[PDB]
Amino acid sequence: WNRKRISNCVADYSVLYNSASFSTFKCYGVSPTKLNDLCFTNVYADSFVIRGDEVRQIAPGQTGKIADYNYKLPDDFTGCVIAWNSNNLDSKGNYNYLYRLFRKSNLKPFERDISTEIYQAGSTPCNGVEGFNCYFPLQSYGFQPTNGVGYQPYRVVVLSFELLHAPATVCGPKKSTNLVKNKCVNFNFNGLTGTGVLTESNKKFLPFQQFGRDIADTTDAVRDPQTLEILDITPCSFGGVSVITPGTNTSNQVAVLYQGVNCTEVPVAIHADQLTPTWRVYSTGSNVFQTRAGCLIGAEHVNNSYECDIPIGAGICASYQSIIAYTMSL
Amino acid sequence: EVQIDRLITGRLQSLQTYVTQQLIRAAEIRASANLAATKMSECVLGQS
Amino acid sequence: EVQIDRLITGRLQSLQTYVTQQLIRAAEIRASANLAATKMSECVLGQS
Amino acid sequence: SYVLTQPPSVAVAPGQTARIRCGENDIGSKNVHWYQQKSGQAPVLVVYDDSDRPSGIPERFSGSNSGNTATLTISRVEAGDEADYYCQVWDSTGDHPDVVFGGGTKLTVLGQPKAAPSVTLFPPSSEELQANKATLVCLISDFYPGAVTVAWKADSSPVKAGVETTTPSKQSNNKYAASSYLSLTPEQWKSHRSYSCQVTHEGSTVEKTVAPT
Amino acid sequence: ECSNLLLQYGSFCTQLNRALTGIAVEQDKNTQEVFAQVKQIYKTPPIKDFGGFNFSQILPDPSKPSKRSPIEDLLFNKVTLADAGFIKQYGDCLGDIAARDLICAQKFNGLTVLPPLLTDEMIAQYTSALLAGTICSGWTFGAGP
Amino acid sequence: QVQLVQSGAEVKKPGASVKVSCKASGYTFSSYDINWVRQAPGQGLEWMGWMSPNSGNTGYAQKFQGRVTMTRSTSMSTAYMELSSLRSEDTAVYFCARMSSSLTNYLDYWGQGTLVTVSSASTKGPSVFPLAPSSKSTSGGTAALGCLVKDYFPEPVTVSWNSGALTSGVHTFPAVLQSSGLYSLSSVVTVPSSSLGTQTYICNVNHKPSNTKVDKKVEP
């Protein structure tokens, strides 16, 4: 089988699927929805011509003459195996296309074994004889225009997609945009959808290492396709809401505990530009007490020792006296 | 893949139901064994 | 859309197995911590 | 039937760009490789794929494969680029697997001027006639470009039978030199009265003669 | 879109988050039934007239700025939390801050590891109060007055 | 550091057989596939065949099947391309070239090459003809001193002068292909005319494969 590496594509994958010539288009490890918007490292194209009945053998986990002794696919195959009928073109008849039936062992996945070695199924060690019990392993396709269903010629091109092998230059179109840093954006940096802010990475990477797989198997390292710089992927800033309430018959005053984020980061870590105008009073406070589990915004710090009414994290309590955010006495 | 994987899903929920109710019964005979430690700690080795 | 409904549904059941395991563990922590409340009340605040 | 076709030569100025291509029908469906062979040593690979380069060779050399062409680009041409280049498209070739090589491109740098040839002709000495043998030697070693035509005439007869000529080679200061030898018995050395070594370079000719004592 | 798929099941993760919330409030209840038995805190006394019973490792130290004791300086230093918290991976990490951490991708996990409501200096304050109750109180300090 | 070492040069008769070798060290030789590429002087590089050393499977070019006997031995890690029934067109340099571990098979390491000579001429010891300036247009009118060597078939002839102590102005041209098969070199010098009678000149010619050395002093 012929092998081609394809490196630079900016054009789309829309011609893959979406045509009636492509009759069989089962994609195992990827969806056809992902074809239009993806970005990958390497593209390999494998091409051969088979019969119609052995179309089902070219799959993960399938067996036969072709899948054992001619062409092997792995079980975790990411890509699309394509089959289409070619009855007019290859069948004139013509017997020039061959296949391998006899081999000593089954083939490894994506491994090519070209040989004209006589298979030893007989007692004698005969060499170079095309006769009885010296089996020549190559047999010919008997293609005629009188072929039945499953015995007509079919043409196959197999596309495989790879990760963490090459600098990513093979990926489809979006809106023409330039890079910004130090702000929270939907980055598509080598074309993957996600939200994060990237800095320059201090890691030294070999040039086959393009992406990264962490302990949760997400992308944590990435390299630019134009400049050969290295950057890491983390998402934007986090925080939480824990509301201080008395009973609703008493008062409608509240305060917010923020659970562990420093108070200069908490206007930035919340989406305060798109927030409700009530809550940004409760995000930037005049009396803000930083403690171990963050800081409480929307109440007043007093020093005086009161017994606890509302049990609140990191040694603070609240009481209705206005609501005071006091270090609790014990 | 589809039918054997649906069998592994059903047998995995059957095995998870078996080990979930056996973890709850492991908590019940574990509470009965903590009870069978405290009983005979002051039932046999002591007097309640 | 029905494809990743089942593909995300394969990922959904990991948390309930976790919090069932952590809740039997939290019942064990609650048994040892009511045991610890009994140990402060009857070994530190009293004598058992 | 697939055979790789390459042009014979291309000449560029130093510091400029060079365009060397190896392109045929449906070469974009196959892989292209490129190699460098200097004169008299082992070949070295300089381009690994359609565009990817190996280590050692810098970003001066680049290429691309699209359609019916695969063109190597050489940027900021220096003196060291003058070598032989071959494209190595692998093909199935009717299920007989072949490693097809190209015809070869010879890339030459410019910047060296033309010098006129000076001729040195040597008579056969008396010590070689003591060994009963004669040799008329004409050495030309003072011109930079090309190959000159050496002719011999002796007593209104153009002598061709007996002329042995070494191929011209690069000397130490990178300039061409050619050597021609004529073998003769010593009794015809004194029989014929006139001899000539005539050298033609770019239309003009330089001719000198020798006297047989 | 995942969150809309999760709200198609409705009240799983309401009860799952309420169950872990009840576990966290239950650990606050465990922390208050263990340590917060009394509301009569005796503060840390000058070390005098203890009869020779050397309590120097279990009272809090004056030298170190936190209220953790030298026996607690053994126990808080050998138990590795593997950098589990809220601020360590979420607070400073608007961008790439402290990569190749001991635990990784908690950003895609969202483990809000809450600090305890009684902190370790205030657990040290309660246990020092329970200490000074045991030094110069009987079992009478848990019985109100 | 992957290196490929070939054997010494070959001198042959037509109809004989070669034993061209290519030794490799420092890497696992059996996993990696070896090609042989020939190159005549004045011609492009020509693929001859491909060889897998561990399995022993050999594929050959469509013109060269049967004649070519590419073999190997992992006992001493040496390959052997033994071509048989030598003919006059088979004079070239032979390169052992390894394809890559990755697929599509770029050639990544080569050998330095060894040269085979196919001719029917016999071996013969060298004869020495000197030339010295003794007259006008051989002396005076811009002409040199020399020593001419012929009647030798193998290539290595070592020339140094005046007991091997003269270096200045020495030119050693390559040997011309004479039609009888016996090659010839001409060595010249540039010397001062006043030093012709005061300094003696000796032409030393050494040739190891025929073991014949003819040397004598050169004077006008």
Side-chain angles (χ1 to χ4, degrees), chain A residues 69-90:
Chain A
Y69 314 124
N70 296 258
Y71 179 79
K72 185 69 166 188
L73 293 174
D75 293 353
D76 56 330
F77 170 74
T78 298
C80 298
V81 176
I82 315 166
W84 62 89
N85 76 76
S86 62
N87 183 42
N88 194 2
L89 304 190
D90 295 327

mmCIF file of all heavy atoms in Angstrom, chain A residues 69-90:
data_model
loop_
_atom_site.group_PDB
_atom_site.id
_atom_site.type_symbol
_atom_site.label_atom_id
_atom_site.label_comp_id
_atom_site.label_asym_id
_atom_site.label_seq_id
_atom_site.Cartn_x
_atom_site.Cartn_y
_atom_site.Cartn_z
ATOM 1 N N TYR A 69 -3.339 -10.871 6.543
ATOM 2 C CA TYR A 69 -2.121 -11.016 5.758
ATOM 3 C C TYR A 69 -1.850 -9.874 4.788
ATOM 4 O O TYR A 69 -0.821 -9.905 4.106
ATOM 5 C CB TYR A 69 -2.150 -12.341 4.986
ATOM 6 C CG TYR A 69 -2.593 -13.527 5.813
ATOM 7 C CD1 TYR A 69 -3.677 -14.311 5.413
ATOM 8 C CD2 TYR A 69 -1.929 -13.863 6.996
ATOM 9 C CE1 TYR A 69 -4.089 -15.406 6.170
ATOM 10 C CE2 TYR A 69 -2.332 -14.952 7.760
ATOM 11 C CZ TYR A 69 -3.411 -15.717 7.340
ATOM 12 O OH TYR A 69 -3.813 -16.796 8.092
ATOM 13 N N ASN A 70 -2.727 -8.876 4.690
ATOM 14 C CA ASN A 70 -2.537 -7.833 3.690
ATOM 15 C C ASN A 70 -2.459 -6.433 4.278
ATOM 16 O O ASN A 70 -1.537 -5.682 3.941
ATOM 17 C CB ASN A 70 -3.650 -7.897 2.633
ATOM 18 C CG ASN A 70 -3.640 -9.185 1.826
ATOM 19 O OD1 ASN A 70 -3.183 -9.196 0.683
ATOM 20 N ND2 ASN A 70 -4.198 -10.255 2.382
ATOM 21 N N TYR A 71 -3.394 -6.054 5.150
ATOM 22 C CA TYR A 71 -3.433 -4.693 5.681
ATOM 23 C C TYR A 71 -4.111 -4.721 7.041
ATOM 24 O O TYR A 71 -5.256 -5.164 7.151
ATOM 25 C CB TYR A 71 -4.172 -3.756 4.718
ATOM 26 C CG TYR A 71 -4.282 -2.323 5.185
ATOM 27 C CD1 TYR A 71 -3.201 -1.453 5.055
ATOM 28 C CD2 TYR A 71 -5.472 -1.830 5.725
ATOM 29 C CE1 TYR A 71 -3.290 -0.131 5.471
ATOM 30 C CE2 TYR A 71 -5.573 -0.509 6.140
ATOM 31 C CZ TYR A 71 -4.478 0.332 6.010
ATOM 32 O OH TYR A 71 -4.568 1.642 6.420
ATOM 33 N N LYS A 72 -3.418 -4.236 8.068
ATOM 34 C CA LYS A 72 -3.916 -4.264 9.437
ATOM 35 C C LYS A 72 -4.045 -2.844 9.973
ATOM 36 O O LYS A 72 -3.123 -2.034 9.827
ATOM 37 C CB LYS A 72 -2.989 -5.092 10.334
ATOM 38 C CG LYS A 72 -3.476 -5.275 11.767
ATOM 39 C CD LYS A 72 -4.695 -6.169 11.851
ATOM 40 C CE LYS A 72 -4.958 -6.622 13.275
ATOM 41 N NZ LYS A 72 -6.031 -7.654 13.333
ATOM 42 N N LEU A 73 -5.192 -2.549 10.588
ATOM 43 C CA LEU A 73 -5.698 -1.407 11.340
ATOM 44 C C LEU A 73 -5.713 -1.715 12.834
ATOM 45 O O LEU A 73 -6.045 -2.835 13.231
ATOM 46 C CB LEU A 73 -7.114 -1.043 10.888
ATOM 47 C CG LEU A 73 -7.274 -0.493 9.475
ATOM 48 C CD1 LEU A 73 -8.741 -0.337 9.139
ATOM 49 C CD2 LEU A 73 -6.576 0.850 9.392
ATOM 50 N N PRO A 74 -5.363 -0.766 13.700
ATOM 51 C CA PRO A 74 -5.428 -1.018 15.141
ATOM 52 C C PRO A 74 -6.839 -0.798 15.678
ATOM 53 O O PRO A 74 -7.735 -0.316 14.983
ATOM 54 C CB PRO A 74 -4.443 0.006 15.730
ATOM 55 C CG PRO A 74 -4.163 0.999 14.640
ATOM 56 C CD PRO A 74 -4.907 0.606 13.404
ATOM 57 N N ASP A 75 -7.022 -1.188 16.940
ATOM 58 C CA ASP A 75 -8.337 -1.095 17.563
ATOM 59 C C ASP A 75 -8.688 0.333 17.962
ATOM 60 O O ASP A 75 -9.856 0.725 17.875
ATOM 61 C CB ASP A 75 -8.405 -2.019 18.779
ATOM 62 C CG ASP A 75 -8.330 -3.486 18.398
ATOM 63 O OD1 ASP A 75 -8.366 -3.789 17.187
ATOM 64 O OD2 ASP A 75 -8.235 -4.338 19.307
ATOM 65 N N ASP A 76 -7.706 1.118 18.393
ATOM 66 C CA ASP A 76 -7.921 2.521 18.752
ATOM 67 C C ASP A 76 -7.638 3.467 17.582
ATOM 68 O O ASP A 76 -6.930 4.468 17.695
ATOM 69 C CB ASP A 76 -7.083 2.860 19.983
ATOM 70 C CG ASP A 76 -5.597 2.580 19.790
ATOM 71 O OD1 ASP A 76 -5.258 1.661 19.014
ATOM 72 O OD2 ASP A 76 -4.775 3.289 20.406
ATOM 73 N N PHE A 77 -8.256 3.176 16.441
ATOM 74 C CA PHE A 77 -8.000 3.924 15.217
ATOM 75 C C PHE A 77 -8.807 5.216 15.226
ATOM 76 O O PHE A 77 -10.041 5.184 15.293
ATOM 77 C CB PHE A 77 -8.344 3.072 13.995
ATOM 78 C CG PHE A 77 -8.335 3.833 12.698
ATOM 79 C CD1 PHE A 77 -7.127 4.209 12.120
ATOM 80 C CD2 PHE A 77 -9.527 4.145 12.041
ATOM 81 C CE1 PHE A 77 -7.103 4.907 10.919
ATOM 82 C CE2 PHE A 77 -9.511 4.847 10.845
ATOM 83 C CZ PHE A 77 -8.297 5.223 10.282
ATOM 84 N N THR A 78 -8.113 6.349 15.156
ATOM 85 C CA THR A 78 -8.747 7.657 15.038
ATOM 86 C C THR A 78 -8.660 8.094 13.581
ATOM 87 O O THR A 78 -7.565 8.335 13.062
ATOM 88 C CB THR A 78 -8.077 8.673 15.961
ATOM 89 O OG1 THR A 78 -8.237 8.256 17.322
ATOM 90 C CG2 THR A 78 -8.700 10.050 15.782
ATOM 91 N N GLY A 79 -9.802 8.190 12.924
ATOM 92 C CA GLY A 79 -9.840 8.546 11.525
ATOM 93 C C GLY A 79 -11.073 7.964 10.867
ATOM 94 O O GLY A 79 -12.039 7.613 11.538
ATOM 95 N N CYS A 80 -11.017 7.872 9.540
ATOM 96 C CA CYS A 80 -12.134 7.390 8.739
ATOM 97 C C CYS A 80 -11.625 6.400 7.702
ATOM 98 O O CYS A 80 -10.666 6.694 6.982
ATOM 99 C CB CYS A 80 -12.854 8.555 8.049
ATOM 100 S SG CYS A 80 -13.593 9.772 9.175
ATOM 101 N N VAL A 81 -12.266 5.235 7.622
ATOM 102 C CA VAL A 81 -11.982 4.245 6.588
ATOM 103 C C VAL A 81 -13.062 4.359 5.524
ATOM 104 O O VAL A 81 -14.254 4.227 5.821
ATOM 105 C CB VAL A 81 -11.917 2.823 7.166
ATOM 106 C CG1 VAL A 81 -11.729 1.805 6.054
ATOM 107 C CG2 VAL A 81 -10.778 2.719 8.152
ATOM 108 N N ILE A 82 -12.650 4.611 4.283
ATOM 109 C CA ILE A 82 -13.556 4.997 3.210
ATOM 110 C C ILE A 82 -13.533 3.909 2.143
ATOM 111 O O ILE A 82 -12.457 3.473 1.726
ATOM 112 C CB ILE A 82 -13.149 6.342 2.588
ATOM 113 C CG1 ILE A 82 -12.799 7.366 3.661
ATOM 114 C CG2 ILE A 82 -14.299 6.896 1.805
ATOM 115 C CD1 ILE A 82 -12.079 8.560 3.106
ATOM 116 N N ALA A 83 -14.711 3.489 1.689
ATOM 117 C CA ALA A 83 -14.822 2.536 0.592
ATOM 118 C C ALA A 83 -15.837 3.036 -0.425
ATOM 119 O O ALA A 83 -16.884 3.574 -0.054
ATOM 120 C CB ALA A 83 -15.228 1.149 1.096
ATOM 121 N N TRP A 84 -15.524 2.858 -1.710
ATOM 122 C CA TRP A 84 -16.454 3.218 -2.770
ATOM 123 C C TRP A 84 -16.224 2.298 -3.961
ATOM 124 O O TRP A 84 -15.102 1.846 -4.201
ATOM 125 C CB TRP A 84 -16.303 4.689 -3.182
ATOM 126 C CG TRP A 84 -14.965 5.086 -3.737
ATOM 127 C CD1 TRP A 84 -14.574 5.039 -5.046
ATOM 128 C CD2 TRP A 84 -13.834 5.564 -3.001
ATOM 129 N NE1 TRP A 84 -13.280 5.478 -5.171
ATOM 130 C CE2 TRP A 84 -12.798 5.797 -3.930
ATOM 131 C CE3 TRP A 84 -13.594 5.815 -1.646
ATOM 132 C CZ2 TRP A 84 -11.546 6.276 -3.548
ATOM 133 C CZ3 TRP A 84 -12.347 6.290 -1.268
ATOM 134 C CH2 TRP A 84 -11.341 6.515 -2.216
ATOM 135 N N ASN A 85 -17.294 2.033 -4.709
ATOM 136 C CA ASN A 85 -17.226 1.110 -5.836
ATOM 137 C C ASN A 85 -16.570 1.767 -7.047
ATOM 138 O O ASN A 85 -16.782 2.951 -7.325
ATOM 139 C CB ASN A 85 -18.632 0.543 -6.135
ATOM 140 C CG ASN A 85 -19.583 1.521 -6.866
ATOM 141 O OD1 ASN A 85 -19.479 1.776 -8.072
ATOM 142 N ND2 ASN A 85 -20.529 2.065 -6.110
ATOM 143 N N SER A 86 -15.755 0.989 -7.756
ATOM 144 C CA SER A 86 -14.984 1.450 -8.906
ATOM 145 C C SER A 86 -15.094 0.458 -10.056
ATOM 146 O O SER A 86 -14.091 0.038 -10.639
ATOM 147 C CB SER A 86 -13.530 1.670 -8.517
ATOM 148 O OG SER A 86 -12.937 0.460 -8.076
ATOM 149 N N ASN A 87 -16.334 0.069 -10.380
ATOM 150 C CA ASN A 87 -16.597 -0.992 -11.353
ATOM 151 C C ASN A 87 -16.271 -0.569 -12.783
ATOM 152 O O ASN A 87 -15.810 -1.394 -13.580
ATOM 153 C CB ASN A 87 -18.065 -1.418 -11.248
ATOM 154 C CG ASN A 87 -18.415 -2.559 -12.180
ATOM 155 O OD1 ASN A 87 -17.650 -3.511 -12.332
ATOM 156 N ND2 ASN A 87 -19.574 -2.464 -12.820
ATOM 157 N N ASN A 88 -16.487 0.704 -13.118
ATOM 158 C CA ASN A 88 -16.247 1.184 -14.475
ATOM 159 C C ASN A 88 -14.752 1.361 -14.741
ATOM 160 O O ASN A 88 -14.270 1.040 -15.834
ATOM 161 C CB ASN A 88 -17.004 2.503 -14.684
ATOM 162 C CG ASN A 88 -17.107 2.930 -16.152
ATOM 163 O OD1 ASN A 88 -16.647 2.247 -17.068
ATOM 164 N ND2 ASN A 88 -17.725 4.084 -16.371
ATOM 165 N N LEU A 89 -14.002 1.842 -13.749
ATOM 166 C CA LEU A 89 -12.630 2.280 -13.992
ATOM 167 C C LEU A 89 -11.646 1.115 -14.009
ATOM 168 O O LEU A 89 -10.892 0.948 -14.974
ATOM 169 C CB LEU A 89 -12.216 3.310 -12.938
ATOM 170 C CG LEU A 89 -13.070 4.571 -12.771
ATOM 171 C CD1 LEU A 89 -12.362 5.565 -11.868
ATOM 172 C CD2 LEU A 89 -13.394 5.218 -14.114
ATOM 173 N N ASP A 90 -11.627 0.310 -12.943
ATOM 174 C CA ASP A 90 -10.613 -0.731 -12.805
ATOM 175 C C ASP A 90 -10.904 -1.944 -13.683
ATOM 176 O O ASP A 90 -9.973 -2.585 -14.184
ATOM 177 C CB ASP A 90 -10.491 -1.152 -11.340
ATOM 178 C CG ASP A 90 -9.978 -0.032 -10.456
ATOM 179 O OD1 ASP A 90 -9.158 0.777 -10.938
ATOM 180 O OD2 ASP A 90 -10.393 0.039 -9.280
#
